[PDB]
Design a binder for this molecule. Sequence first.
Ligand SMILES: O=C1NC(c2cccc3ccccc23)=N[C@@]12O[C@H](CO)[C@@H](O)[C@H](O)[C@H]2O
Ligand SMILES: O=C1NC(c2cccc3ccccc23)=N[C@@]12O[C@H](CO)[C@@H](O)[C@H](O)[C@H]2O
Ligand SMILES: *Cc1c(COP(=O)(O)O)cnc(C)c1O
Ligand SMILES: *Cc1c(COP(=O)(O)O)cnc(C)c1O
Lengths: 810, 810
Amino acid sequence: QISVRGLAGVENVTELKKNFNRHLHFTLVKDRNVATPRDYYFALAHTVRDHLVGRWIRTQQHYYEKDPKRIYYLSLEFYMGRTLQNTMVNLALENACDEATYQLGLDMEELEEIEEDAGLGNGGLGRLAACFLDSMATLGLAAYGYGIRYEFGIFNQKICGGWQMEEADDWLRYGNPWEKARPEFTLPVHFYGRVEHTSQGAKWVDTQVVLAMPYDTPVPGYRNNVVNTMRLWSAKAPNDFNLGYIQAVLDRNLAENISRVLYPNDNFFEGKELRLKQEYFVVAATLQDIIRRFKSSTNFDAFPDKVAIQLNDTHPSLAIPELMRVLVDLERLDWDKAWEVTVKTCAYTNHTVLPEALERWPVHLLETLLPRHLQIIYEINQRFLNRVAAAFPGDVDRLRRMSLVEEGAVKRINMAHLCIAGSHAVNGVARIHSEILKKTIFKDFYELEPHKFQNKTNGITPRRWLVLCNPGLAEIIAERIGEEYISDLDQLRKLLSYVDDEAFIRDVAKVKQENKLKFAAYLEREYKVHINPNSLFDVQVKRIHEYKRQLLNCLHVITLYNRIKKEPNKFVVPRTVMIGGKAAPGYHMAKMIIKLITAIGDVVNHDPVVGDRLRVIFLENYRVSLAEKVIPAADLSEQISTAGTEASGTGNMKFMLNGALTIGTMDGANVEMAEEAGEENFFIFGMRVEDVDRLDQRGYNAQEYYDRIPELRQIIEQLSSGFFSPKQPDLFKDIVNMLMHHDRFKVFADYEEYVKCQERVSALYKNPREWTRMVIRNIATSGKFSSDRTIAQYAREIWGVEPSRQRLPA
Amino acid sequence: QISVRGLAGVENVTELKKNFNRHLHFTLVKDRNVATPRDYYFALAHTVRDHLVGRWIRTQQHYYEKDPKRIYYLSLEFYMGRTLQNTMVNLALENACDEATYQLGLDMEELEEIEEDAGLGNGGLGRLAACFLDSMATLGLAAYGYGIRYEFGIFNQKICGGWQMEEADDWLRYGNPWEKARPEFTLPVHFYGRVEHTSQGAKWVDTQVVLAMPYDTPVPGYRNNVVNTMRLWSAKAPNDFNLGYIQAVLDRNLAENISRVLYPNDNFFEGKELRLKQEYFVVAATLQDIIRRFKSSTNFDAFPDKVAIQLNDTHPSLAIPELMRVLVDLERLDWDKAWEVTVKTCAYTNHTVLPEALERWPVHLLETLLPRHLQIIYEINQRFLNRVAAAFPGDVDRLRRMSLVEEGAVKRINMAHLCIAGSHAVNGVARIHSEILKKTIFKDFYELEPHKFQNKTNGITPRRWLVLCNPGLAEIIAERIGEEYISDLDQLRKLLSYVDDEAFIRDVAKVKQENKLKFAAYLEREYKVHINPNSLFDVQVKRIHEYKRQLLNCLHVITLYNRIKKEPNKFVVPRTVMIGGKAAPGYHMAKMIIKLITAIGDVVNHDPVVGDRLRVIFLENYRVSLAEKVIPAADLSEQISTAGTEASGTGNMKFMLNGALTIGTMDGANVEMAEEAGEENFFIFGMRVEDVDRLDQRGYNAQEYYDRIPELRQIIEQLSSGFFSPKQPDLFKDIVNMLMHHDRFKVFADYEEYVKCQERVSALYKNPREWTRMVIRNIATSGKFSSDRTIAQYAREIWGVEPSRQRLPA
Ligand SMILES: O=C1NC(c2cccc3ccccc23)=N[C@@]12O[C@H](CO)[C@@H](O)[C@H](O)[C@H]2O
Ligand SMILES: O=C1NC(c2cccc3ccccc23)=N[C@@]12O[C@H](CO)[C@@H](O)[C@H](O)[C@H]2O
Ligand SMILES: *Cc1c(COP(=O)(O)O)cnc(C)c1O
Ligand SMILES: *Cc1c(COP(=O)(O)O)cnc(C)c1O
């Protein structure tokens, strides 16, 4: 149908059809009389998987022959979403499969909707991992994603009476056709035990063994015939485990619990033993694999020339002492040589500002679980603090602040400190964030080793986040400037010469309108709710957190509502306000915010005076596949974190690419986005970082704003008095109380400037042509925010490898 | 190579080869450079599975169209063993696959050895289930095996220092290519809750739900293109289960424990809740499936014309009250009509003599777990005892003895009593056993309803147990009388006209010698032990139990040893004595017997005076696949249970078919075996049932035998004094003590007659020609012991269906 989706050759279509029927019969053991849509999805999935296989085998073969330097991306999270469409896009099979399925009398779109999200992540960090794998494959890097195959991913969110309920994401129930179990590459991982000191150095003995069984998933690059591997480990008990009889067999589940469930805390740290077991499990199994592969090329001097290990935050920080343990205790390298190898191998990406999100493991935990690793950590600390002392003689305070070991009631290891010490490169994930690392939280580490600190501004893959989710926009772009932009997104800048082209303006607005119609219809069928598709689609989708200030959004929504009620017969630009996201199960306040959103909806959406001028919708179960639908439908992207709290953000980039204007603070990558588009093409409001600091010094008194802003006082009185909760008038006292006395994120401070800025948005929306021109200026300057740019910077400036757009043979 | 293995057409071989390479590439994602024998096994397995698929789909289609009466074989055990060779035999693909693999440079036999046994059974009962499925498919019956997909089957037996160690049978580790998960046919099963009585009858409420997910495995008939289904249920938690967050997800394992592990008690009853959950789980899921299928043909009068349910012992006895519960509580039939339907649908096979093996469930267990089923059981009991009272007025004692409810400290339900009451047919598993049911343990039930009691003497499938495990013997038989005997084993009787044919005598002895050479070699490589292949192979393989009197065998072995030591320079027929089997993990005495066997081996096998004249070998990890190797190699089959204790036995039949002579008691099917062959062609010894009764009346005094038999006294003194346990002289005091004071199975009573009979065996073995002639007379009369005969009797005399040898189209 559309060009970017590839050719549908007669031969290709015929071949896909016959392979689809072969899999239905032989693979699924169904005839056409009893097959369900789900059988058809599986038959198609198996058919597309077959086109990966040749390329996967040849790619891995190629890496054995050429023996390039290998990149190991260690993450506890890969937020992959669905695989079927992504595979079709990257192998140029989408039109052929559409055609082949059409002729079988099936609708491919309906079959795509049957696929489960692989939800093995919480949000931004997990998704960044997924976007990176895509870009690494597209840039022909010999890269491997390593993580955990959780049996249960991020929970499915149900709303009951306006409250979040969690239910288990049983994503493997029907089988995963994309993974290949490799039970033959199973590896032992050790826990507990104790350290014996002998003549021949330290020995780790009397350990409990858990096996790590790898599952490999193909990662296809964009039309380059490259297929990289994502290897995820699953925990399995050894067969002698506990070995009255019956109970011993049932107790195998204790070991296998390690890979059972993803911890659902976005940007918070819980010091749980099971979480630490997950961290070591992935590190220990991965390092053995890395070393095995390296030895099939006694001399570890070349190790860093053949191996890069990237740590996705501190979650796999144990890679540093584990690498030391293997090199020192097993390979019998001296300490200094092993340390050299380790530093030159490892690099650490920080994704964290908020101190409560930083991993600080109690020493008693590490002592019991990983006795040898704790010894190695103490040794690292001593040698590190010896260098600090020599460089800064007499600065005893610096020594305290820089220690890997935090003193206190409980001693803790600061895993971030361990990562900086043991890595040749430390980066943040947007320029402002990287600067903040150098100026505040790692100021001391920066002064000792300035050379280590880099920036790598985040990005998103334009495959999933444009071509896949928004084919209509991809196509009208491709009509003017060709297809090359999909693997070279800077080419979108050529669209600035179409900003006054009437036809292009018409087409950009048409695509947006079509996406909105399609999303409105989706809301009706799947969730029995009606919305005006001619309204401005104001969407804030992201995990529910105080720093992201969904509450600020709520305050705006109630303001619009109170303004309509005061002057019912005055024109206002209609809006559909859509807020979506999951709260961490133990985060009370996040759960109250969801409840407040739905309570506002309950009042606003049933007020007859409001009409269809204002609708508030909570989007249930926000996940990757819902993001692919709602982001192409959005007009206004809400990126309204308190300045200094969002390290980067990546949602922001998704919306920029997909033809929404941004209302945001100068936070994270918002800063670079506004710089690329021009500040005049961006709705900036609120305190800068500098302003937040000024407020903190003299002290934040919310009362002052309540006293000076009547519109805000009204809202707070409504909340307090039960306007939004008639049956339980005090339901939201925790929210009021926090806003008035304990608001770390200064919601009131940005309120006035936000509401004013929101008025400027409405004004521009009244002028479709000028709205769409500003949209074009955004899309056209979004090139920097491709993960291809990001990975190319990682490769040249950290990993020491050159990317390539050259194709492997087919 | 050999004719019974089928044709190797040029086309067939070429096609198998290309499909093997296709699966290696696309299914396994391997090239030939990195593939292991295990990858080759899987490629072959997937290639053979493909030939089942067409036939499986067409067979199930046929049953929908023709709508024949359906047979449901409910068992907690299916001891299937390996599937690959069996599939090849039944589809006539064995020579073609041999040829195809040969040309790929692989050895098919080596690939067969990589397949795991499906060990979802303990021994005789589980294997009977497997043999039956084979015969049901071969006889074209619309039959379904229903059971539990245990994650862990019967444990792997290791011997350490002569002691049994158990380790977990992780049979699914590498995947099961033979099963098809059917997650779309998942069904809820209920536990706990309580009963509400309303206007509209009883309601079972506030239950815990476990889901039952079916896995289907194909069961091919012998060259008739019929493929039946074995459906096994796996337990899965619902997604709202327990739904702090993390722990709720981890607690899902409590529900899934139901299908985790097979209980390893052969012929013993443990009243464990988890075992009762397994029993209900398989019953509840199966009955829903049965009813669903029946409704796709409100009127249950035809239910018994369309459904037969066979209960494999009492393990699925809850099918009776469950069927009543569904019909009465859900379908709203009146009690009497529902009861009629139930009785006419259900039939019960008893496999049990020993009272400690009979299932007697505490009422408090059923009360908590299955409140409604207990109500229905009490109601069944009342109405049943009302009929007893009317037929036998005043016989209050009979009422007590026949009650489904046993009075005592703990009240118990006698599940056997429930099965007789609720079934139209009750059978034992050999003639002597069926008579004993009528004369002793169910005498009362027989007098009330004589029409219900039948015999169905057990059998073994000649596919696995001749063609598959002993191709050389199959072939020389086929040379003379053709191939038809494989599906009509009575034709073996034609071999009696070859008993004086010199060439046939030569060939039978040659095959035996080749099997022995091959098995001797197997012992050397896999277990570093050497044996004389010219010795008589005396084998006793079966689960370790007191009633099977492995100890009697031990007494014979020590007798031979003491006789050699007394007269070292006298000729004795050389013997390799091989004893194998598993003990239940909590059965102390069975574990001591294994230890004694290995301790005798430790003395006998290292005595230089003995030479290679006597060797004692404990065969480790006896299982179906080891039985396929050792049974064709055997000369003497040891079937030496105390008269009245072995319900049937089936090992006995396997050896008869495979050219071993039998030494046995008149127990179980031994009686019918001797009647078929002629008593002169069988080594019968020991007490009959009548003799055991006579001994019990006056009392069994072991001392008397010890006092009168010097040879036996010597053995007991050796055991006591530490001759067989020098470092621990009192190691075997429990064994001595039991033999002398607490022997329920009267080992000493049969000792003299056993040893004498063993001398007659040795004498005949000195005369090869006459030994082989007697072997021929055994093989030739083994036809009755085909499971095809057995199933044909079940079908005509219980299920009311006619078997068929007519082929479905290919
Ligand atoms: O989305 C994120 N979660 C965590 C994060 C920070 C700290 C601890 C965690 C623990 C688990 C999961 C995620 C985290 N960090 C985040 O990383 C993204 C990728 O660079 C950034 O765009 C976000 O601005 C940042 O908030
Ligand atoms: O092998 C068997 N196990 C049990 C058995 C009896 C009682 C309780 C059980 C519980 C679990 C497993 C098996 C049993 N019964 C047996 O059934 C076989 C098939 O008819 C007979 O040939 C055996 O003579 C008999 O011993
Ligand atoms: C991109 C993405 C995120 C990250 O969004 P932010 O707005 O940067 O927090 C979270 N969740 C999903 C499902 C995404 O696709
Ligand atoms: C046939 C068989 C049995 C039953 O043997 P008996 O001697 O009748 O107890 C037990 N186990 C296996 C592995 C078998 O093949």
